[PDB]
Design a protein around this ligand. Structure first.
Ligand SMILES: Nc1cccc2cc3ccccc3cc12
Ligand SMILES: Nc1cccc2cc3ccccc3cc12
Lengths: 155, 158
């Protein structure tokens, strides 16, 4: 029985959107800028940043977007995306993230959003079991597809 | 022989995702292949001894949502019809992962063995409650909350 040492950087990896609520429904409706499907998050303790990778449909077309947020002394984060954003992590653990975001768009309109995100955790022992079974069946490693990275890098 | 196994898999039902799929015949999982399956949901029924698979596959340049029902055998394996006949076994299973072995025989008698690793997206009640309270605190109407786990309009992996 063992578990990796808890580190903020250990939280980095594939994350998925569960729910997003908005004070302004138009922001999360079809073609809304905040109807975001998360792919990956990267936390950097040293730099005090969080890199967001997500997908959003715009003009009937899916787009991959990257946003870097920077931490402030008070602990909140600021990011530039469809206006200015100040977001706050309300709850965070190895498997979930609950956040509150305040957005002020290019017209001075303020929208507040809430979101619940979950992390996809792949444990070492499970990967080992998969590879052993795969080698037992005489399957060459080049004949294995990584579906998770495909989902993390869509088009 | 061996003795019966107490089967309580019902609680493992929910959203699941494909991590890796291996195959003895690469054609079956290459792009446009029948087993290049992106899982979405699994539902286990301990009373009927079945498992419902819900996944997406791209065929001839078009995305398809597929539903397959598998039935458990006395042997402990499950059988299901999909692009031929399939007999699969759960080699390792927990609240977070599933490692399985599947044997498929297509319409031409060709045998293909596949291995797979799937992961569950677990949403805890404690975290859901935190989200709902926060959402209520900010005066957001339940109608103004979008569910991204079970949504029709989603990005394409390829
Ligand atoms: N700061 C941000 C930048 C880009 C997208 C965001 C999407 C969010 C969704 C729910 C809650 C907070 C969010 C913050 C975001
Ligand atoms: N029963 C099934 C139906 C449809 C696709 C499957 C893809 C699989 C991939 C690896 C291991 C087992 C699998 C079973 C499958």
């Amino acid at each position: 029985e063992e578990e990796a040492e808890q580190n903020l950087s250990e939280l980095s990896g594939p994350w998925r959107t569960v729910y997003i609520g908005s004070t302004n429904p138009e922001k999360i409706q079809e073609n809304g800028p905040f109807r975001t499907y998360f792919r990956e998050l990267v936390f950097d303790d040293e730099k005090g940043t969080v890199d967001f990778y997500f997908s959003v449909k715009r003009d009937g077309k899916w787009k991959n977007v990257h946003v870097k947020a920077t931490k402030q002394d008070d602990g909140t984060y600021v990011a530039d995306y469809e206006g200015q954003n100040v977001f706050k992590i309300v709850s965070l653990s190895r498997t979930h993230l609950v956040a509150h975001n305040i957005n002020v768009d290019k017209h001075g309109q303020t929208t507040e959003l809430t979101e619940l995100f979950v992390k996809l955790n792949v444990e070492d022992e499970d990967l080992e079991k998969f590879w052993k079974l795969t080698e037992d069946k005489g399957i060459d490693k080049k004949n294995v597809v990584n579906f998770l990275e495909n989902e993390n890098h869509p088009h």
